[PDB]
Design a protein around this ligand. Structure first.
Ligand code: SF4
Lengths: 427, 161, 353, 117, 95, 180, 160
């Protein structure tokens, strides 16, 4: 009954914001999201299903992550339009629904629910932001069509629109493919990745924080629900990691570089999909979400519109703690010890090798080493001599947020035997 | 096909039109207000269109200023084809009491006149007489003083162009 | 069509044709009657000339109409200019079929209706959208923008209240439990006269029908005196006649539909001769509506949108939920007799202060 | 349910109506004077330009349409309840009420902001 | 069965449209056609699997409507001030 | 949208041409364009006797014509120093006000029609008809009546004018109220 | 069945071909309207009737009318302007079109199904208990999606 909280706050604030100063609405939306997360903790080990709607360990972990991302992204945004909060609220529920069901059609409706309000969140209205928004909507609705014909073909090979239905030969194979298309696009796996560079660079940074954390989370959550075969998995991984890192090399811009990098990262997480461990994947995404949320909070404190790579430089001198935190984020996203990113990566790699897929694992790993070029090209870039750069040094809100996130990262780098004990049933 | 070539058929359509004669009024001066009286008493006519497109009979009622002439021109041209022109009052018919730089000294210059109706303004019942004229004119029931039978539509007689 | 028979396809056709040409003669003679009824309201006389009653004037008019020269504008999309008038009439004529004017067998062996179907109101709704398609399309097809704008005002307004009609129609469906006109009617045979049970929805349905060219919005518009109505204003001989024809058939289709649904059309408590009463109710609404045609001002459609969208439609779904509450909990159907009577007592008494 | 038999009758009806309409168009088109000239074809009002040049239109028509699609979807959903209603009991009513109130919150939002605009 | 095959074909057609179309709007329409291909297939299989594919399709229609409203809103905003839409006119974002 | 409301169409009344500078459903500015009825009296009348002009005076404002008649008659009488008889003056106030009722009847008839609906043009027309019948009775004309003279008025009132003015003076109070 | 069935499916494909082919946007959309009519017919023949009627009302009546309003409000009828035709793409676009049919064709080939259940015609009468029922959550989710849709669409325009 986190869903209850979500629907309630969204619907209520809709009309309330007519009577409230936009700030009052910000206070409100913030409050709501945090409360939903609270209900998530109080339900740990209490898994609950109602309709096609189902809350279990997975739903719990992945919406814990998603809710976290939504709170952080609302923290930064001070625009005096109450809707620029409202849309976030909507989107959040949408992602929760996406992670919370096996029903293909409810999954579809949930997809529209989460995806439509982000299209509107893509507008600072800076000339790029309309281009970004456009590409996003067109490619998005296309994928909508695909996941829908996929649900229709799943209902095709078998009596149900609910996943887990017994399944045929080639038609079933086809149907699982058509579900895999949309669900894959939403996660930025190659070669579905083309939007990712454009939209991250085009959309206002804090929004991108929201996307690059919450969306990827929810998407992998729904992905685990699908039955996907080893060969396809191999393909997606290979392409994601290769093109992701290689093209990320070519990147002169922080956001875009981060996009390609995130393509590679979706590539890494997709290995957990081999066994679908989800204690492992849950962990990986915990670490990743923390680090990335951090990274984009910092990219927000630089500029909302665009951040080049040099802008990151000299950040240590300016603010020591933010320099350090960004560094840590770069390392956790690199998957280097002793950071939680290493245990997430390791857990995915472990499930991968456990599944006995070797060449794939290897390639993923090799080009994962490729990623260190740009990961240090940022993390170390922190220490160079500061060039002329925009800097607005945050509220306590942001400083304490970013640092907290980093600390949570490295804490679980050393003691995953804290949370990992229950990313499972919740003991 | 213009209402023509069967003795039964053409007469039939010709009544159809004469009794249907569908005035499209083109008000100008006080004459227009003297036709708004005609609107009251009326009984084959006074539904309009109003839009030119929809009507056979063009009623020029008032002084037609020289600057106003090219306008009335297109309104007439922008009418469907089987169309008739009634010219109301002295100012329209001839130059009227205003004989000068300002005003067209016969409307027949710009649009083919079917029927003329004298007076300043003409009594409305005279305009009924004129539409009965034009009624009975398109029936091919109409004659001039020289002995000649008059054609149903004038502006079937001008060269367009 | 649980209880009702089917005439052979040839007879369905023949009846269809009869209803179409019958609707032709219907519309023309109705134009005569409104001309004269208006004349009486404004204390003048009608057209007695080209009589005898003046009733041979549609012959004369139709005769003007054809032989008139049908003009197709260049600067108008060639295909769409022609096609537009075609659409508007086609989708108007059809779906007067459904309306039963009598019990089965009473057409001299067959079927007072043409088609009945099982999903009734939805057919009506569906066919109603498409005429409007014709409207804004003609607006485009003519490719004079002055025509367009008006056609757009038109379409926006029509579509607004057209939405209104649905949420209007919800309430009585709850009571009867059928989408069939014969069943609704028969429900009014037994329990009786649905407007007794459904009144607010009766109001919003009627007034929703004001938008569909009925007059009193009229920033429909007719081109007259405004930023014009659009669709006509570019058509001459037959095509223009076709648009006018369609709007009028819609007018009488509505004057039929109002008694048919909320009242007991035909299917009166007493006497119950099959045709005559539906024609009489049709006549009643038709005359009252003509009075409306003459005797009330326009909306501007700024207001019309305000009135339907802001007032009629919210009111429509509000009553639906009430009748939904009543039917869902099965209470009696009496509570709706009481409720509708009472709401009528309210919506009237506030006029006369 | 009801037979397929009647619907074919509906197709009939459509055929008859379409045929009569086309016949009317044929009478119009065939019987006329016919005289294209540059002046007649030209849109409206004597020196013309009523339409003139305008860079598109108010979005108000768009808004009315988008409104209409959503509320009509609402009705499209409300119809199946309206039929089986007392059959779906209090919980049915409560579901339909939830849905309805949701979309009514929708309408209420866009009203208080309004589209005078 | 003919129906399912034709639905697949329609999906293909909508694809051809999306790839071909220069303007945003017509791309969106091709998308709509794809969506309906899906719905029809759903109907066939509903007749096969008992009627849940039908309700599915209905929900789908609603989904479609919502995204239509939103998508047309975006299409309007992006090229209201801006001149002819053609989707290639925005190249600013490159790798 | 600079919308062009034409000269005579669509029901922009009395042959005016309007450039409504207008985007949407509002009105930015209307740029009015006149001159379509220019008959050129001010020149023509330089070519007519002062008597002859009295035929050209009613003809401009043709609704309230007698106000033209009155104004011109007066300005000339003044200029040539003429003395207008009391009964003529009284008749001139009667006619002026009767012609005013005619004009006004017209103004609100057209107004009510122009936006809003058709019916009340007719009742105003009925009362106007009684007024025009009054004018025909006294001047032999509906309007443009050649009656007023620089001295006074063309001839005296017939027996029948008085009774008929009363009839309308009787119905009008009830009548004007009905429009009201 | 097949006598008219061939005809109806042929009309479907033909219509689609039009909507993707014609470079007159109005003509296109209109062809899609024709499509929705035929498709609704086929729905009914396929024992789905209510879905057919809502298909016409919403999809044909509402949605594409909003579309039409958009293309009439913005012109764009002559879509092919300002180019970047990149013609080498047209056959490549056409190529890919063929393939997505081929793969679906394969999965549906050698596929036989029991298209026999007594659906009783997909009247809303029997559909309602599914809607408010097994699908009620999907429904409420949808409704919420619509509400979010309206507010999104509103803030999306809303010049200020
Ligand atoms: S003829 Fe006389 S009444 Fe007619 S416009 Fe001329 S001055 Fe006025």
């Amino acid at each position: 009954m986190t869903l209850a909280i979500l629907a309630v706050f969204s619907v209520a604030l809709t009309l309330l914001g007519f009577v409230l100063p936009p700030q009052g609405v910000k206070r409100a939306t913030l409050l709501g999201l945090a409360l939903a997360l609270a209900s998530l903790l109080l339900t740990w080990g209490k898994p609950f299903a109602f309709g096609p709607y189902a809350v279990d360990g997975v739903s719990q972990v992945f919406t814990l992550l998603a809710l976290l991302g939504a709170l952080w992204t609302v923290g930064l945004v001070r625009s005096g339009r109450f809707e620029f909060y409202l849309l976030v609220l909507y989107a959040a529920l949408g992602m929760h629904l996406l992670a919370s069901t096996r029903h293909l059609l409810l999954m579809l409706v949930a997809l529209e629910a989460l995806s439509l309000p982000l299209y509107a969140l893509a507008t600072w209205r800076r000339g790029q932001g309309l281009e970004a928004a456009l590409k996003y909507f067109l490619l998005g609705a296309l994928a909508a069509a695909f996941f829908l014909y996929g649900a229709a073909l799943f209902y095709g090979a078998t009596g149900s629109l609910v996943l887990g239905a017994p399944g045929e030969g080639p038609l079933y194979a086809l149907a699982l493919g058509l579900l895999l298309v949309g669900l894959g696009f939403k996660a930025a796996l190659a070669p579905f990745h083309f939007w990712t560079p454009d939209v991250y660079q085009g959309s206002p940074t804090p929004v991108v924080l929201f996307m690059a954390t919450s969306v990827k989370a929810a998407a992998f959550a729904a992905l685990l629900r699908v039955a996907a075969p080893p060969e396809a998995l191999a393909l997606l991984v290979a392409l994601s990691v290769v093109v992701g890192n290689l093209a990320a090399l070519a990147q002169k811009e922080a956001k875009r570089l981060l996009a390609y990098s995130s393509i590679a990262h979706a590539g890494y997480m997709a290995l957990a999909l081999y066994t679908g461990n989800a204690q492992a994947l849950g962990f990986y995404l915990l670490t990743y979400v923390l680090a990335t949320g951090l990274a984009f909070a910092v990219l927000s404190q630089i500029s909302p519109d665009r951040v080049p790579l040099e802008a990151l430089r000299g950040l240590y001198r300016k603010d020591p703690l933010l320099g350090l935190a960004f560094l840590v984020a770069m390392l956790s996203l690199l998957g280097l010890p002793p950071l939680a990113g290493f245990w997430g990566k390791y857990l995915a790699f472990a499930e991968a090798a456990r599944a006995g897929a070797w060449g794939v694992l290897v390639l993923a790993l090799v080009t994962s080493a490729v990623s260190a070029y740009y990961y240090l090209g940022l993390g170390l870039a922190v220490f160079a001599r500061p060039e002329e750069t925009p800097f607005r040094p945050g509220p306590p809100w942001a400083r304490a947020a970013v640092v907290a996130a980093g600390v949570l990262l490295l804490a679980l780098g050393l003691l995953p035997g804290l949370v990992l004990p229950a990313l499972a049933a919740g003991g | 096909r213009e209402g023509i070539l069967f003795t039964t058929l053409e007469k039939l359509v010709a009544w159809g039109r004469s009794n249907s004669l569908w005035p499209a009024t083109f008000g100008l001066a006080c004459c227009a207000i003297e036709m708004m009286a005609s609107t009251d008493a009326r009984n084959d006519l006074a539904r309009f269109g109003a839009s030119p497109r929809q009507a056979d009979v063009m009623i020029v009622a008032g002084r037609l200023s020289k600057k106003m002439a090219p306008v009335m021109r297109r309104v007439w041209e922008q009418m469907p084809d089987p169309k008739w022109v009634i010219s109301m009052g002295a100012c329209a018919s001839s130059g009227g009491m205003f004989n000068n730089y300002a005003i067209v000294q016969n409307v027949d210059s710009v649009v083919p006149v079917d029927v003329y109706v004298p007076g300043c303004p003409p009594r409305p019942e005279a305009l009924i007489y004129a539409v009965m004229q034009l009624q009975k004119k398109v029936r091919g029931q109409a004659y001039n003083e020289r002995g000649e039978r008059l054609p149903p539509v004038a502006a079937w007689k001008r060269t367009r162009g | 069509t649980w209880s009702y028979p089917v005439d052979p396809y040839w007879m369905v056709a023949l009846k269809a044709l009869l209803v179409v040409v019958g609707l032709l003669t219907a519309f023309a003679f109705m134009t005569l009657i409104e001309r004269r009824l208006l004349a009486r309201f404004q204390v003048r006389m009608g057209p007695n000339r080209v009589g005898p009653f003046g009733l041979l004037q549609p012959l004369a008019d139709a005769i003007k109409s054809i032989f008139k020269e049908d003009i197709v504008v260049a600067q108008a999309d060639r295909f769409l200019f022609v096609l537009a008038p075609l659409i508007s009439v086609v989708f108007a004529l059809l779906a007067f079929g459904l309306i039963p004017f009598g019990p089965p067998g009473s057409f001299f062996g067959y079927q007072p209706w043409v088609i009945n179907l099982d999903l009734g109101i939805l057919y009506l709704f569906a066919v109603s959208e498409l005429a409007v398609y014709g409207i804004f399309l003609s607006g485009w097809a003519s490719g004079s923008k002055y025509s367009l704008l008006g056609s757009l005002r038109s379409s926006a307004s029509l579509i607004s209240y057209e939405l209104g009609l649905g949420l209007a129609l919800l309430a009585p469906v709850l009571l009867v439990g059928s989408l069939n006109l014969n069943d609704i009617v028969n429900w009014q045979k037994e329990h009786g006269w649905l407007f007794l049970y459904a009144f607010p929805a009766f109001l919003v349905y009627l007034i929703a029908s004001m938008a569909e060219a009925a007059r009193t919005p009229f920033d429909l518009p007719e081109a007259e005196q405004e930023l014009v109505g659009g669709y006509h204003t570019e058509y001459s001989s037959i095509k223009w006649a076709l648009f006018q024809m369609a709007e009028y058939i819609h007018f009488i289709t509505a004057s039929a539909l109002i008694p048919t649904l909320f009242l007991g059309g035909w299917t009166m408590p007493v006497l119950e001769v099959p045709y005559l009463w539906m024609f009489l109710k049709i006549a009643f609404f038709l005359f009252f509506f003509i009075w409306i045609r003459a005797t009330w001002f326009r909306l501007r459609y700024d207001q019309l949108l305000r009135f339907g969208w802001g007032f009629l439609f919210p009111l429509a779904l509000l009553w639906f939920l009430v009748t939904a509450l009543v039917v869902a909990l099965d209470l009696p159907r009496t509570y709706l007799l009481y409720l509708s009577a009472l709401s009528f007592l309210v919506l009237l008494g506030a006029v006369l202060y | 349910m009801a037979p397929i038999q009647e619907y074919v009758g509906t197709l009939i009806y459509v055929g008859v109506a379409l045929f009569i309409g086309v016949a009317a168009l044929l009478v119009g088109a065939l019987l006329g004077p016919k005289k294209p000239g540059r002046a007649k074809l030209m849109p409206y009002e004597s020196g013309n330009d009523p339409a003139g040049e305008v860079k598109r239109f108010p979005v108000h028509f768009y808004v009315v349409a988008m409104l209409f699609i959503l509320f009509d979807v609402e009705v499209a959903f409300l119809w199946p309840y309206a039929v089986s209603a007392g059959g779906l009991g209090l919980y049915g009513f409560l579901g339909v009420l939830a849905f309805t109130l949701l979309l009514f919150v929708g309408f209420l939002y866009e009203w208080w902001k309004g589209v005078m605009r | 069965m003919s129906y399912l095959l034709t639905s697949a074909l329609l999906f293909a057609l909508g694809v051809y449209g999306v790839l071909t179309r220069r303007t945003a709007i017509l791309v969106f329409l091709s998308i709509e056609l794809m969506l309906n291909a899906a719905n029809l297939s759903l109907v066939g299989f509903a007749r096969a699997y008992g009627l849940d594919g039908q309700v599915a399709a209905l929900m789908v229609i609603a989904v479609a409507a919502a995204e239509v409203a939103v998508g047309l809103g975006l299409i309007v905003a992006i090229f209201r001030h801006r001149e002819s839409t053609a989707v290639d006119d925005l190249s600013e974002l490159r790798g | 949208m600079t919308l062009n409301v034409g000269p005579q169409h669509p029901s922009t009344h009395g042959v005016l041409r309007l450039m409504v500078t207008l985007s949407g459903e509002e009105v930015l500015e209307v740029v009015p364009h006149i001159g379509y009825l220019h008959t050129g009296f001010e020149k023509t009348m330089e070519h007519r006797t002062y008597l002859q002009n009295i035929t050209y005076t009613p003809r401009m404002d043709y609704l309230h014509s007698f106000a033209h008649d009155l104004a011109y008659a007066l300005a000339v009488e003044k200029l040539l120093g003429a003395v207008v008889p009391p009964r003529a003056e009284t008749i001139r106030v009667i006619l002026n006000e009767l012609s005013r009722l005619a004009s006004h009847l017209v103004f609100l008839g057209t107004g009510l029609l122009d936006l809003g609906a058709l019916t009340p043009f007719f009742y105003a027309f009925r009362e106007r008809e009684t007024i025009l019948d009054l004018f025909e009775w006294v001047t032999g004309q509906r309007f443009h009546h050649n009656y007023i003279r620089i001295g006074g008025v063309k001839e005296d009132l017939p027996e029948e004018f008085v009774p008929e003015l009363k009839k309308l003076l009787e119905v009008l109070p009830h009548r004007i109220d009905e429009y009201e | 069945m097949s006598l008219l069935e061939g005809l109806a499916l042929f009309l479907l494909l033909l219509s689609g071909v039009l909507v993707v082919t014609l470079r007159n946007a109005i003509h296109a959309a209109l062809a899609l309207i024709l499509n929705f009519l035929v498709l609704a017919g086929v729905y009914v023949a396929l024992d789905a009737r209510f879905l057919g009627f809502i298909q016409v009302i919403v999809y044909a009546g509402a949605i594409v009318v909003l579309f039409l309003f958009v293309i009439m409000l913005l012109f764009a009828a002559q879509g092919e302007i300002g180019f970047d035709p990149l013609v080498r793409s047209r056959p490549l676009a056409a190529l890919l079109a063929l393939g997505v049919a081929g793969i679906l064709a394969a999965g549906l080939w050698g596929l036989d199904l029991a298209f026999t259940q007594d659906l009783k015609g997909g009247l809303p009468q029997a559909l309602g208990p599914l809607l408010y029922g097994d699908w009620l959550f999907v429904l409420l989710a949808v409704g919420f999606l619509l509400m979010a849709a309206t507010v999104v669409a509103v803030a999306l325009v809303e010049p200020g």
